[PDB]
Amino acid sequence: MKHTELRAAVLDALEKHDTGATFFDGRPAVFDEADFPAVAVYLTGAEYTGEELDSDTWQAELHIEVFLPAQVPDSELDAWMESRIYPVMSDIPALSDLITSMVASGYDYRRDDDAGLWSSADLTYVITYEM
Amino acid sequence: MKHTELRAAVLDALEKHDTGATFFDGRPAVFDEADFPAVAVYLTGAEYTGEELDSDTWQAELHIEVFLPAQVPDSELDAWMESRIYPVMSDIPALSDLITSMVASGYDYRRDDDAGLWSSADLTYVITYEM
Amino acid sequence: MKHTELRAAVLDALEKHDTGATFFDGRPAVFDEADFPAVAVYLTGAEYTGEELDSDTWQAELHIEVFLPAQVPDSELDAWMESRIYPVMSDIPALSDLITSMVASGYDYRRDDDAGLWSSADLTYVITYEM
Amino acid sequence: MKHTELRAAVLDALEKHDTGATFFDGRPAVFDEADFPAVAVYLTGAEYTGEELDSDTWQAELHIEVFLPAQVPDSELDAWMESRIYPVMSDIPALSDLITSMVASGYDYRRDDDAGLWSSADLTYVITYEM
Amino acid sequence: MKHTELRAAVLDALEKHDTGATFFDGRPAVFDEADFPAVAVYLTGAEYTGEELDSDTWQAELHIEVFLPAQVPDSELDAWMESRIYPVMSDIPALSDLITSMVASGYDYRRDDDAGLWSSADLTYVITYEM
Amino acid sequence: MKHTELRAAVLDALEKHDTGATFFDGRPAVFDEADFPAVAVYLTGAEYTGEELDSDTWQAELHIEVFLPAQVPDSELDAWMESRIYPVMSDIPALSDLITSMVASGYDYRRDDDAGLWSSADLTYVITYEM
Amino acid sequence: DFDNLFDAAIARADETIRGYMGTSATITSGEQSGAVIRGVFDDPENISYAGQGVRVEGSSPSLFVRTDEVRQLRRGDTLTIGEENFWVDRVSPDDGGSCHLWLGRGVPPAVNRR
Amino acid sequence: DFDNLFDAAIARADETIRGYMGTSATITSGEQSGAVIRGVFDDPENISYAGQGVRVEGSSPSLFVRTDEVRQLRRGDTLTIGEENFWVDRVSPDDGGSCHLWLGRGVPPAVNRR
Amino acid sequence: DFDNLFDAAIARADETIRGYMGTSATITSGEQSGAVIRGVFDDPENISYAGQGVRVEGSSPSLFVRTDEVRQLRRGDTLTIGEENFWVDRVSPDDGGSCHLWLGRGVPPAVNRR
């Protein structure tokens, strides 16, 4: 779908700033101890919310996650989310060209319990697109 | 009964395009290291949604699964689904004659986690028909 | 009591046409590889939705289960469940005598996950009857 | 108290009918393979629905259980329940005076899936009472 | 917090009548087969629903749990609760003044399925208090 | 986000109160029997409660966990809640300027079940803010 | 007869162990009907609690007898372990020289076949 | 005695271990009434937490009695172990020469048969 | 035959154990059509319950024949073991000198490929 070029555009808009994180696109990930704290984005949903008899007007949700090793304090995750992701993605004209409406949905934390090999902060947005 | 009839119809509709994926029908499937990326089709639901005092007019859920090996990136999945799956059911006269109404419901992803043998993508559509 | 009478009547209504499967009545089943693909009928529910101050007018849910070998394709399952049982069960005068209202509920498929000992299909039918 | 006398009265109502089954009261039960198919009664719920200010009118639930040999077909359970308990539970003057109102709610089955040493047939009554 | 003194007052009130049980306060309990059938009181909930634009007006839930050895019959459980706690707590002046309103919620039972070294009966009440 | 700054501000406001328990910030914790009963604080939620087309008006939840040795009676937990945290936070200018509206939501207890290592008490607030 | 040079040995082992342990019993009704066969009976213990507690402590009678003598047994078959009476509820597939007979107590519950 | 050639040896062995192991106990009430049986008394420890911490730690005594003389021991009658009295709850099926006796503590709680 | 010093030994072990254990099996259908393969047959038991009681007790037979002759077999093919007929549902990859053959029973179920 457009999700290919949508992911390409959003990752390009992310990488325009200073680097410092791997930008693995989509799902495969596979980190190991070489590509530490990084960002990965993917899509879910894709239902048939019609809401108008002119186009399908499908909708889905994007999940972008920041992964940091071990048990780093949550302040680092807060700062990284607020500096590297939140403002830069706030206004991307290309995405507005590809989709109709972009709206933030959620932003949560999680971390592994057995040996705690990772600690991720997830951000999910809601997207309305036509296909 | 139209389940086998509609399954054969959609199977031939997919087959009439380019090939490259196996076309398992029904349920048992069984892939092994010979029947990699492939497609299957089946039905779920089968309720008693009468909705009119003329006939039973049942409705159910058509599930179309596409299976890929292990950790292929999701972008390839999107490209394959759009190039092969989504447009073909845009307009099929066999679908029009066989059932009453057809409507999409969702498009989702999943993958094998333990040992990661497989990855699957599901097209779920709502089909209303009078058998 | 009616449940024994209802089960006897429905099993007789099954046995009127050509055979081809065992007609295990009741519930306990116990099959082994000697009474293979077969059909049983059992009951659940037994609520007290009165709906009128003249009699209890209880309601129940009859499950007609049918078992087939391991992982046989759903084609023969559809044929059996739409031709062997569904047409003949559409009109049974004895049950109509013994039943106040007879309304279909649903129909489902399932397969044995572990080792695939069987493949089963269930006709679930809601019944309103007075004892 | 109220529960004790209710259980005593229902046990008396069962015992005045033709016997043949143990009348274990209370929760502990404990059977072994000598007190086979047998009946027991107990009470749960005990909440504080009001329905007025003058009287507190607590409501509770009456579980009635009967145990039969393992994989005995449901016909025996149906005959037993609808011939020895449900007709008896139609009217008991002692329960009529002891409680405010009695109503019928449910009637279900269960059995020991593993091991398989018993089959349980249960009825669920709803009782409103004042203490 | 007034929870500690509330528990002290209610335990004094239930100690006003004859003893015959231990009077554990709060959670830790530790019963053992030397402090034979006992009773404990504790609180849960404690949320910030105001329902009056003048103060916090918190609401909590009070658990009174009485512990009996292993597999005692429920009839003596009912006799215990209907003689030792339920009547005695029906009206206490100190408890009436300490809180705003008191309403009964429920009364239930629990037991240890495996091993079976205890049998508990729980009285659950809703308390509206102001701090 | 401002979560780090707000958390630091509320942490300093709490630390203004008399010491005696450690004031770990965030969530990684890692205590060991050297820094026993103490407190930690962090944030959850961070949703997109707009409520008006003028500012983000985000909402989140503030978690405060106070940890006590093993199986201390809950009276001490109540004393710590009403002597260290809940009253002292009733009016702090820093949060008043940093956030718009704060509401208390929950106050509960939970201790380690196996081996009874600790006992945590949770205080959850709902906070509205901007970015 | 046995084309493995191991099946005869294991059959001899099975007959020896059956003669050296578990005594014999007899069959009541069934195709075999009056018949006395020597096996190895055991009664493992099993516990279930059903509801809150309904403990139904009981046994799982097994016989583990030679397969040839127990053909055409079906499931409605009964028998008696001397004074004690049983009824075969299940027959395990042969392991090569033996089969397990799983039995319940008392009269088998109905038939409920047709 | 019995056509076992193995259960007789089992009986001799378990009689020897009962003689060389465990203690004798006096039975109170029941059809046996005053009687003394030698058995191997043990008491594993088992705990339950109920809520988060409600530790109700206890023990589950067993005796490994022999059916030959512990026939019809029922459940209601109590059992004295040395200078302390327990009460029978479960009697396991015979392994061929003996079985397991399970004990509660104190007095059995009521009867509740009716 | 390979840079192993071990695979030759394990292959000799496999042929010896196939000569000492298991039986001959006559394949039916397939590209081999009628052919004789020596395999170590076993028939363990596996039971499912499905609903409340739907005990469907059966078997999970395996043959476990040498790898070299198992090629070009697929799944729709069947086979006969003396008097009884089977059909291969699975074939394991070679572990070094052989591979297991997991069998169904009777006629293979349909095709259902397109």
Add this chain to the structure above:
Amino acid sequence: DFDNLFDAAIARADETIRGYMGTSATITSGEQSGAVIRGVFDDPENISYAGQGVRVEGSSPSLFVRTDEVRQLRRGDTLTIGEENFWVDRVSPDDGGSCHLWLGRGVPPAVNRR
């Protein structure tokens, strides 16, 4: 003294092992008040994870002293081993000649009796 011919031996074994590998423990408070015993201290480790993650690190020290002196100890009292001070939380039932002692650390948390 012991009607077992085995209790004496196991008591001898426990005494010998406590002598040859145990250590002195100084009980404090309680009816025994200041007294010295010999026990086999161990400190197995355990970890709990509260919430999304909380690495609360601790251990479950045990002593396993003989029951004869451990009698009348209850739970409120504390214990001092060498330079380390503990407090008894639970006493396992006698195995015949001894029992485990479970220890907390520092001061027992209140009493919370009535």
Add this chain to the structure above:
Amino acid sequence: DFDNLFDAAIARADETIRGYMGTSATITSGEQSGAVIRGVFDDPENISYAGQGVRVEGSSPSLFVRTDEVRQLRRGDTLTIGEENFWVDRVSPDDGGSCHLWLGRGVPPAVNRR
């Protein structure tokens, strides 16, 4: 070289097992490009049902070669074992003298680096 007096022994052990077991395979692509390395390839079974029946029966190839030549192996590069073709997908950490290599089949799925 090895500052343990034992790592030399473990290196001798690993070279001995690799010489007396397993096979040699030629690395394909990658920075090593054309080279030959000897390991001990094994391959157990793995089954996944996905849906009701979607069984995808496959294999889990592992190699377990020494650590010296496995360096700068990365992940995307392939590997041919004898006549078959595979590709590395995971490398275990060094156990002292070696590490396990997990091999997928066919072509690695894309790269998806950025």
Add this chain to the structure above:
Amino acid sequence: DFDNLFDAAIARADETIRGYMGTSATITSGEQSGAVIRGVFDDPENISYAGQGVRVEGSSPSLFVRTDEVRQLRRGDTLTIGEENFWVDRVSPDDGGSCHLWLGRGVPPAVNRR
């Protein structure tokens, strides 16, 4: 030295296994600052999958060092394994003669305590 008769043998065994097994790790930073110790290092492999595929395959280094040389080691300070550097994430309690040092890679993440 200590009233054990057994911990002396334990300490001698620990010293011998340190000498014959493991490497010399030098510490940096912390109150110990620079110091050299002998310990047996191991690094088991652990993998987490989190979401759809988030394989974060890593290692769990342990050192098993004597407590006497690592008294008041704290947690914030780092450690170096020869050419490689780590940081102590946790320390196990002593089992009688030593404990286990569990290590993380890279730099410790902040402090986050006030």
